[PDB]
Amino acid sequence: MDEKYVNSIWDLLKNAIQEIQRKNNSGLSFEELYRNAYTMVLHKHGEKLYTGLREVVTEHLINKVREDVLNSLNNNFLQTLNQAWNDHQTAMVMIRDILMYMDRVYVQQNNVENVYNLGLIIFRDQVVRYGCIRDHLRQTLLDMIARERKGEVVDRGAIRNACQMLMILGLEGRSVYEEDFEAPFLEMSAEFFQMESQKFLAENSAS
Amino acid sequence: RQINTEYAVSLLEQLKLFYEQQLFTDIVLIVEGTEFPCHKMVLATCSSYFRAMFMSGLSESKQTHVHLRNVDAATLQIIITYAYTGNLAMNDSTVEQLYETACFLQVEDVLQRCREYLIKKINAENCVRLLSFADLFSCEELKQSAKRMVEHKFTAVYHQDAFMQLSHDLLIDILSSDNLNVEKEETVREAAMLWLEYNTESRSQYLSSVLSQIRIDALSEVTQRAWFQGLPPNDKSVVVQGLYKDMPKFFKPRLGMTKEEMMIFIEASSENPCSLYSSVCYSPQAEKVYKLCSPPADLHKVGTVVTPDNDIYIAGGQVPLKFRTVNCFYWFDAQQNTWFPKTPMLFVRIKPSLVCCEGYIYAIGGDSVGGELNRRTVERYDTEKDEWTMVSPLPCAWQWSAAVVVHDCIYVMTLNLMYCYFPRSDSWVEMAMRQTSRSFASAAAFGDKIFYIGGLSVTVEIYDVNKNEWKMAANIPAKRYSDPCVRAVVISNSLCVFMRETHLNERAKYVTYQYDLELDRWSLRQHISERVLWDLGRDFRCTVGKLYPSCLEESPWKPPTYLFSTD
Amino acid sequence: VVKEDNIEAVGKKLHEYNTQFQEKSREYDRLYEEYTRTSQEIQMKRTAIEAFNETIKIFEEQCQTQERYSKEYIEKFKREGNEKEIQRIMHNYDKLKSRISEIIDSRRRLEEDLKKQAAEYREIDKRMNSIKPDLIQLRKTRDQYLMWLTQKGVRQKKLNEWLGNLPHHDEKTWNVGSSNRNKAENLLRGKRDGTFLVRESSKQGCYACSVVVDGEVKHCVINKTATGYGFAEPYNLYSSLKELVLHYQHTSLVQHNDSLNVTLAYPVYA
């Protein structure tokens, strides 16, 4: 009812979701949380919650993820990439299970996306679609497929996890996959096929 | 291969038997001190809440005691009973708390069942409370239904205490709607005034939003009273179906300023090959005919009844053999042109004499003679309790009898006798007999005078309620060598008879006459040409009611002139 | 008839012009229905536009009533340094001017609707004036072939089957419900021996079987006993107006009337 009461509930929810993002959600009681949420949303306070969701998860992302995968960059890039990917996936699934009633009542009102789609969108844009990480990931993928073409064996698990998470980030299909990975892949494959054809037809017979 | 059914029901009954004796109880729910042992799997499969709480893998799936707050013990018990059985025992006393508890556990099945139950239970008393409930719990279907119900009877529900405790959004969305059934804008103005003065200290800041929604410069139907009524005969209804349509919706005449008194014809023979048992209405003031989607289940043999509050109902009748008799009760939505079914009757009837008395609709006779005490039964419906109650049955089995209501008293007439029923006494009293024995006659109530007209040969017999005496008035001017068919209906605060006459080698003719009670003379009122009208048959039922032509239906289905007099 | 005399191929002409003529009557009454609907539409539109006019007039009356209020009771609402009290005529003035503007726009919309419907009505009305002379001319040719071609061996039933492009098992075919003696004579006017119908007799509760016998429509009242219907009395056990009534059709008892050996072999609408 009172605005300070709603603010205290929102701060408790912030502390709870931040503790969950720390991967230490063992000592938490969800009853409390769903309760608080339902209340918030039935107290005519529907968006504050949404926007703050956005904000917090986003902050989390920038800080943590950047640091991690960037410091990787030079190293074990895809390893920590898929690590943070599945960690964020588990965290957002838990948050969706917490805030499912909001996804039921408030999402269909303002035609906005659900918290799961919102989290995947912000992870695709702020974490994946960022400048200094996009070029690095595409160059690493091109390098690993290039060395795969010339005999050097690479762990197919990393590349298959990268491609499956890229096609998952589309939320509709291969939309983002066509522009983030398929567009350089087609041209690099085309030039590689041209080079191999030129080096094959020049000193070999048709047989 | 489809999943087995008998094994499923056996497993369900075995699970119920195990739950009754408390076997394998792995979770213990604590609600306000009361304990409930239960299984986690059943609560997960039924409610999405418990599923998410158990699949999280936290201490909630490991701890046997879970404290659930803000949940009623009775509602939780009903939810568990539904989860272990599959049946929901809902009632009008604990439906809102059950829906609240369900919306907390997201029991899709229970939520949908409670939603449809609340939708089928909106009457003229809970509308505002149910609207506030749906707004608080964000149920779009229930919200829209309650909003339409409030718009239908705003002038009758704006006095309730639930209306003054509404929120700001509810007020600004109700007042802005052009579907307010009000005859004058002063009613809406006074409603807004009482709403703002109910709690001034909290609504003093909303006075601008309140005044911005009430149409002050509309001047809908007063401007016609200023200049003159000079037009073709009663062409004010033309201004209604023109000015009201093209309007920026800020000065729009509300829907209540659009209702027009039209002669409601049901079961009227139709030229339409598919629906030859359709229903149409004619506006004496508009001289125009409008189409109705009246048949909800392509049936017939149903009676008509118009309450003083201008409500239409049909009951009884029989649907074609897929002619099985039914009990369905349908109320007409004058805004959506669609009938909403109600609680079915207790006994099937064919053309039951439906009359409104003291707010109750009574079903009198209207059935084939089966059983001495089994027939002649009379039953009334409760508009708010939504239930049928049996009353003192008819003294004798009659056929083609009519029923009217005068001074909150029930009257049924027959061949030559007459019985008067009193709901306060619940008894039947034989009244003054009639000098003529006739059948298939039509009767209409006009003041303390009952008009019995018909016979299948027309004679106007007047009964006095105050004198309990029958006096002859006249014979309906008509033609013997032809085919007569009269329908006595009261419109424009005047008794009338809509007589359909089929002459020798000629088509059916339609014309409405006006009767003078003082001079005991029948005057020609208005000739009803077949410009938009056609053969309506002989078994059609007729009544008088006010409907909105604005959005009822628009279909001539009859070219005005067709004279190929070119020669 | 293009100087032809094959009779058969010349009768095909009769049927060629047959359809062509008809097509016209359909489009003729269609144009009449269009005329009527356009008439009522322009009637309902002129009433709406005069309503618009009188509303604009009364709104101008309110506009000058505002100037009247600027001298009647404005003295105690402008010199006090308040603006919320004057909103009852000042905030009711600007929105009234906007209402005037938008109803003028609505009147322009109704005027352009009027001119566009008048255009779409006159583009087919001028067509009526160009098809009615052709229609009446085609009628005259049909009447010219109703004097010569018709009398070259064609039947009226053949003409009907050309202007249109057991029957006793159906009841409606002969059953004319409650027709009178006159209607029956008119329906069996110029009919063959055996053409019959089942109407209701003037006697209330009785039926009548009118039938062309030797060129004369004889209305034979049907009786009704406990055993059933029937003409005389010995055979008055007819279950209904079906099985045993069609049984009489095949018996054609002459014991009833000397001129009743002609069997009812042709329903009126066979």
Side-chain angles (χ1 to χ4, degrees), chain B residues 513-530:
Chain B
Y513 292 93
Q514 179 180 2
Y515 171 66
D516 193 332
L517 183 58
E518 304 180 1
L519 296 186
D520 193 358
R521 293 183 177 271
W522 292 80
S523 59
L524 165 64
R525 178 171 179 175
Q526 209 224 271
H527 213 292
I528 325 286
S529 219
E530 340 272 310

Side-chain angles (χ1 to χ4, degrees), chain B residues 442-507:
Chain B
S442 178
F446 183 49
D448 29 84
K449 252 92 215 353
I450 303 194
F451 301 97
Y452 194 79
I453 288 140
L456 178 60
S457 60
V458 287
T459 48
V460 184
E461 300 183 2
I462 297 187
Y463 166 80
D464 193 324
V465 184
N466 302 332
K467 298 182 179 180
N468 193 18
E469 296 180 358
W470 288 88
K471 56 179 181 179
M472 300 299 300
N475 291 16
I476 294 186
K479 178 69 194 312
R480 169 234 11 207
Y481 277 150
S482 59
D483 159 56
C485 208
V486 295
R487 294 295 196 274
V489 286
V490 177
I491 193 175
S492 304
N493 197 19
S494 300
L495 174 69
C496 298
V497 168
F498 187 79
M499 178 181 63
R500 168 186 175 273
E501 174 181 330
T502 297
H503 207 267
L504 298 181
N505 298 331
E506 300 180 1
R507 299 181 179 181

Side-chain angles (χ1 to χ4, degrees), chain C residues 63-187:
Chain C
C63 180
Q64 59 87 15
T65 313
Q66 185 271 348
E67 298 291 339
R68 178 182 179 181
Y69 293 157
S70 69
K71 295 297 181 301
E72 213 283 73
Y73 277 152
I74 207 179
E75 185 179 0
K76 307 301 180 301
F77 292 94
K78 66 176 184 298
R79 293 188 177 93
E80 274 68 283
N82 196 333
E83 54 87 18
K84 185 61 62 181
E85 300 291 338
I86 209 40
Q87 298 292 83
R88 309 294 317 239
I89 207 44
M90 256 16 245
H91 216 21
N92 285 26
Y93 201 33
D94 50 324
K95 71 184 191 64
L96 186 143
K97 297 298 297 180
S98 68
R99 166 161 181 77
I100 291 298
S101 62
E102 63 197 1
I103 66 181
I104 286 301
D105 299 330
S106 301
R107 183 171 62 94
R108 295 280 75 90
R109 292 172 60 258
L110 265 300
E111 288 293 337
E112 62 97 280
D113 284 318
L114 280 176
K115 68 158 169 284
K116 69 99 180 180
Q117 66 85 19
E120 73 93 9
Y121 160 76
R122 286 187 294 263
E123 65 96 0
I124 49 182
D125 180 70
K126 262 107 242 81
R127 178 248 295 221
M128 305 179 79
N129 298 91
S130 61
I131 194 59
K132 288 181 179 180
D134 180 70
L135 172 58
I136 64 180
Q137 180 66 211
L138 293 173
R139 289 177 197 235
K140 286 163 216 285
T141 70
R142 160 104 189 142
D143 208 20
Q144 269 134 45
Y145 313 144
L146 250 32
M147 219 277 289
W148 191 81
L149 200 38
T150 295
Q151 274 57 55
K152 293 304 177 181
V154 77
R155 197 62 178 181
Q156 181 67 210
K157 180 62 63 60
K158 211 66 170 61
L159 302 178
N160 295 126
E161 288 337 280
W162 272 346
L163 297 167
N165 300 330
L166 207 67
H168 309 87
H169 284 343
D170 174 52
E171 190 117 3
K172 282 322 129 251
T173 24
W174 26 267
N175 221 288
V176 269
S178 36
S179 283
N180 43 53
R181 173 160 220 119
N182 196 40
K183 196 140 163 245
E185 293 256 5
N186 315 331
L187 280 167

Side-chain angles (χ1 to χ4, degrees), chain A residues 152-168:
Chain A
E152 280 69 17
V153 290
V154 191
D155 197 333
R156 58 185 67 260
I159 173 64
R160 74 167 178 260
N161 292 330
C163 82
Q164 71 181 0
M165 70 179 60
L166 284 176
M167 64 88 60
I168 281 180

Side-chain angles (χ1 to χ4, degrees), chain A residues 28-30 34 38 101 104, chain B residues 53 58 60 103 106 108:
Chain A
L28 276 75
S29 60
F30 277 1
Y34 193 68
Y38 173 86
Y101 184 82
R104 296 299 179 88
Chain B
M53 293 297 300
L58 302 188
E60 293 78 51
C103 98
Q106 295 80 43
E108 332 273 278

Side-chain angles (χ1 to χ4, degrees), chain C residues 1-29 31-270:
Chain C
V1 212
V2 212
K3 208 38 241 113
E4 279 140 4
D5 250 298
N6 196 70
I7 287 131
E8 215 50 60
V10 202
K12 215 197 154 170
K13 278 287 173 62
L14 178 81
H15 174 54
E16 278 149 46
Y17 309 133
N18 276 179
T19 48
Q20 293 160 217
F21 181 77
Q22 250 104 231
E23 316 316 285
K24 279 253 217 304
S25 60
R26 294 183 183 270
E27 60 87 15
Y28 182 76
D29 79 280
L31 289 176
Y32 263 174
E33 181 180 0
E34 182 68 24
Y35 192 99
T36 56
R37 65 159 294 184
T38 49
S39 64
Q40 55 86 14
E41 278 178 0
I42 65 180
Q43 271 262 175
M44 258 255 331
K45 266 356 127 304
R46 88 151 181 257
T47 60
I49 199 61
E50 71 90 9
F52 291 153
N53 294 330
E54 64 90 9
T55 50
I56 293 179
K57 179 60 63 180
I58 195 60
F59 293 158
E60 184 67 23
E61 181 270 350
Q62 298 293 339
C63 180
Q64 59 87 15
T65 313
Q66 185 271 348
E67 298 291 339
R68 178 182 179 181
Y69 293 157
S70 69
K71 295 297 181 301
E72 213 283 73
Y73 277 152
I74 207 179
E75 185 179 0
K76 307 301 180 301
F77 292 94
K78 66 176 184 298
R79 293 188 177 93
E80 274 68 283
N82 196 333
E83 54 87 18
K84 185 61 62 181
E85 300 291 338
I86 209 40
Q87 298 292 83
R88 309 294 317 239
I89 207 44
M90 256 16 245
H91 216 21
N92 285 26
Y93 201 33
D94 50 324
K95 71 184 191 64
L96 186 143
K97 297 298 297 180
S98 68
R99 166 161 181 77
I100 291 298
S101 62
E102 63 197 1
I103 66 181
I104 286 301
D105 299 330
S106 301
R107 183 171 62 94
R108 295 280 75 90
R109 292 172 60 258
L110 265 300
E111 288 293 337
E112 62 97 280
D113 284 318
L114 280 176
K115 68 158 169 284
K116 69 99 180 180
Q117 66 85 19
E120 73 93 9
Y121 160 76
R122 286 187 294 263
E123 65 96 0
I124 49 182
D125 180 70
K126 262 107 242 81
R127 178 248 295 221
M128 305 179 79
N129 298 91
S130 61
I131 194 59
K132 288 181 179 180
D134 180 70
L135 172 58
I136 64 180
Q137 180 66 211
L138 293 173
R139 289 177 197 235
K140 286 163 216 285
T141 70
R142 160 104 189 142
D143 208 20
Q144 269 134 45
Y145 313 144
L146 250 32
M147 219 277 289
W148 191 81
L149 200 38
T150 295
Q151 274 57 55
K152 293 304 177 181
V154 77
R155 197 62 178 181
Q156 181 67 210
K157 180 62 63 60
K158 211 66 170 61
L159 302 178
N160 295 126
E161 288 337 280
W162 272 346
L163 297 167
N165 300 330
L166 207 67
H168 309 87
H169 284 343
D170 174 52
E171 190 117 3
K172 282 322 129 251
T173 24
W174 26 267
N175 221 288
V176 269
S178 36
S179 283
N180 43 53
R181 173 160 220 119
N182 196 40
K183 196 140 163 245
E185 293 256 5
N186 315 331
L187 280 167
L188 294 188
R189 196 143 291 160
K191 274 331 136 351
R192 42 191 170 165
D193 292 337
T195 328
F196 82 108
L197 43 95
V198 175
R199 53 164 196 106
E200 268 180 50
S201 172
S202 35
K203 190 174 155 8
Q204 294 303 295
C206 259
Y207 282 87
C209 180
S210 334
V211 43
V212 211
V213 190
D214 316 320
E216 325 292 299
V217 189
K218 329 266 212 207
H219 309 246
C220 331
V221 180
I222 327 181
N223 304 16
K224 190 44 183 77
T225 72
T227 12
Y229 290 95
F231 267 178
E233 245 337 285
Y235 238 40
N236 239 91
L237 32 273
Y238 296 7
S239 128
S240 58
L241 284 184
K242 236 320 127 54
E243 195 256 284
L244 259 120
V245 129
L246 297 196
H247 137 86
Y248 176 69
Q249 150 210 349
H250 63 57
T251 321
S252 75
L253 285 155
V254 80
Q255 48 116 333
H256 301 148
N257 178 235
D258 273 11
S259 19
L260 246 191
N261 237 346
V262 176
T263 142
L264 328 163
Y266 313 111
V268 52
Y269 313 126

Side-chain angles (χ1 to χ4, degrees), chain A residues 8 13 15 23 30 40 50 60 64 66 71 80 98 102 106 117 119 135 137 141 149 151 153 183 194 197-198:
Chain A
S8 60
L13 264 298
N15 297 17
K23 300 299 298 180
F30 277 1
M40 264 188 100
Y50 190 65
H60 177 53
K64 260 30 107 293
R66 248 57 144 90
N71 118 89
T80 183
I98 292 181
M102 179 175 57
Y106 176 80
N117 293 18
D135 51 355
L137 66 89
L141 294 184
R149 290 176 183 179
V153 290
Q194 292 180 179
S197 60
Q198 290 293 150

